């Protein structure tokens, strides 16, 4: 019982440590791609914002910011899901409505690349905010 716990704790803590730094690095290295944020966000209990989004970001960083699903897919090496589906196909998006027993796609729930989804976009942005707040709380404790 003792040795098994020791082994398990040891392997777990060690293997966390080894890539914790690389995960830190995955937010701490904008050398590859500019305008990172390293575990700081303005959406805390704040369902809408423009502090950078359509302001300081000038189309390019607006399309680059949507690449966050690649960081999720980078997390994916040690295989596990996340609270909003973490697939990256480059620089465009739309958000699903629901999934228990649907037969067709729900990505019309809020368009992300065009501003024209705006009414629906007031809602589905809350999903990625929920994804963020879960991971942040999990970093904090």
């Amino acid at each position: 019982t003792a040795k098994r716990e020791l082994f398990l704790k040891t392997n777990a803590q060690l293997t966390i440590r080894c890539r914790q730094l690389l995960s830190e690095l995955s937010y701490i290295y904008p050398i590859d791609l500019n305008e990172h944020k390293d575990y700081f966000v303005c959406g805390v209990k704040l369902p809408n914002s423009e502090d950078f989004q359509a302001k300081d970001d000038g189309s390019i960083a607006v399309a680059l910011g949507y690449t966050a699903h690649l960081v999720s897919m980078i997390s994916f090496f040690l295989q596990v899901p996340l609270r909003y589906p973490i697939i990256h196909k480059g620089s465009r998006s739309t958000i699903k409505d629901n999934i228990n027993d649907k037969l067709t796609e729900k990505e019309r729930e809020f368009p992300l690349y065009p501003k024209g989804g705006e009414k629906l976009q007031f809602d589905y942005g809350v999903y990625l905010l929920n994804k963020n707040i879960a991971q942040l709380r999990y970093q904090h404790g």
């Binding site: 392997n11 080894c18 791609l33 680059l64 090496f77």
Partner: protein, 199 residues
């Protein structure tokens, strides 16, 4: 009676966790390289959509910028201004005169040369990169060639061929085969750079 799937967890998790080592995944498809899904190089039979091409060019700028800043190679003859799918390269050898890497720009501008200057500049920068890694005599040789001035990408061994970096009109064997081989050289380059960055 508990620790069996625990031993599963610890072994699998640690082994999997170790997999992070590169930025953008590239997969060969048909007669083009696809970089993080985006197709690069329109077929003679089918002009692949310009937003996909431009997006592929956007991400290609993002990749080069990363690889450079990882090896410590710096592009003297260039300044890089990514603007998404509409990215641009200010070649100092051309005083940043015609930076756009994006392609379509009017019906007659099928003859346009903005991207050709950017691709000549880019292929010169690939020669620069080749020398900058050659200095290290790393895991590599020089299997690659490129007639950068006329726009060309070239492969050495069995094929020997070089195809042009300019479509002139249609992307054909020129352009599409050039992109595929240039991407093969970049795949090699990404492997060698990832090694050098890791080391």
């Amino acid at each position: 009676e508990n620790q069996m799937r625990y031993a599963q967890t610890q072994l699998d998790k640690l082994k999997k966790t170790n997999v992070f080592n590169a930025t953008f995944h590239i997969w060969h498809s048909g007669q083009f390289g696809t970089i993080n899904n985006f197709r690069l190089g329109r077929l003679p039979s089918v002009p692949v959509e310009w937003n996909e091409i431009n997006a592929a060019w956007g991400q290609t700028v993002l990749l080069l910028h990363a690889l450079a800043n990882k090896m410590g190679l710096k592009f003297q003859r260039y300044r890089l201004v990514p603007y998404g799918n509409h990215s641009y390269l200010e070649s100092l050898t051309d005083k940043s005169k015609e930076l756009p890497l994006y392609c379509s720009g009017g019906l007659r501008f099928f003859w346009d040369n903005k991207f050709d200057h950017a691709m000549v500049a880019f292929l010169d920068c690939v020669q620069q990169f080749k020398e900058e890694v050659e200095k290290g005599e790393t895991r590599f040789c020089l299997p690659y060639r490129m007639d950068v001035e006329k726009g060309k990408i070239e492969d050495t061994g069995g094929s020997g061929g070089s195809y042009s970096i300019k479509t002139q009109f249609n992307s054909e064997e020129q352009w599409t085969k050039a992109l595929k081989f240039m991407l093969t050289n970049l795949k090699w380059g990404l492997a060698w750079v990832s090694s050098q960055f890791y080391n």
